[PDB]
Amino acid sequence: DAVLELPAATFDLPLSLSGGTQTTLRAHAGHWLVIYFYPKDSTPGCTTEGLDFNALLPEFDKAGAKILGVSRDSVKSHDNFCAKQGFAFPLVSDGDEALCRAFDVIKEKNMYGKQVLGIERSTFLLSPEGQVVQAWRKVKVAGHADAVLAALKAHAK
Template identity: 35%
Template structure:
């Protein structure tokens, strides 16, 4: 994840001169129309990354917070707040600008589809978010056959979204939540000292009545973790379960 790499590089630069570039790492060249395959995974690194991002890599290490699959363990410092929107809730309505022009309103998307898969992600071109988007694109016909519409949201500006969609061959709507208001409504806002605000990686499966039927979070210990390389399959399976 870009945020993890960026922060680690910042910490390293405080100890010794570094000749490396701090520009955001870009995903490897993708094949036309988003059909490239990838085996990238990041799920086990999530708690470690969050400990560092929240401005306390040293404090987390010193406190010995437990993290499955790592020498750090999870404790109260890494506990996430209760979600603002969860399964059974009515999804907050919104309308946001989309890549390619115009706006998309959730109410309109729900009228046109049996389900809307609303997924929030951190940032365009970060490795994990690029893989997640590609998996949705590769499975797009499967979602469409089940009457489901994919909608991506991050706080990136429209021009960056357009570049992301163009280079990745993404054909589903990608929306710009520039001020973070929609991310905040859904409890999917991530605020990081010195780096700013980002959309948290969360996905909501919403039925045509506007009710949340599935919710996945990038959260250690949750049975509904967003598993980047498997996430499209996770959502497809849930659609079959609730349809």
């Protein structure tokens, strides 16, 4: 059922959250987890994506799921973004890109005459046993949160 295999150590990485606490992926055992990676706090696409997930939170709650957004912005940046937008789910400050590398979302583009790395907008659905059962890479924001919810409902039933 897995579409991606993560290194075992990934599940024990301490993930710094908005609000000053930590989590780990193993700590989420027993429920579905949506992990959405986005390139930059407080930009148009990333704000739209976060607000779309936020608006659907009760539907994720029905289906037995939690959401985590992830970028490499600082905890303080995330706190500002969450407060301004009213998000009711946490944001991971993956400052060292450990989680991003585990999910292979750091992609390289030939541009500016160089090799340039960056976060590719991507989302994953993690089962209650920690299996990555669906992936969306190079995400288009419009309609995305709706599509993720529909997929979750399909998998969870």
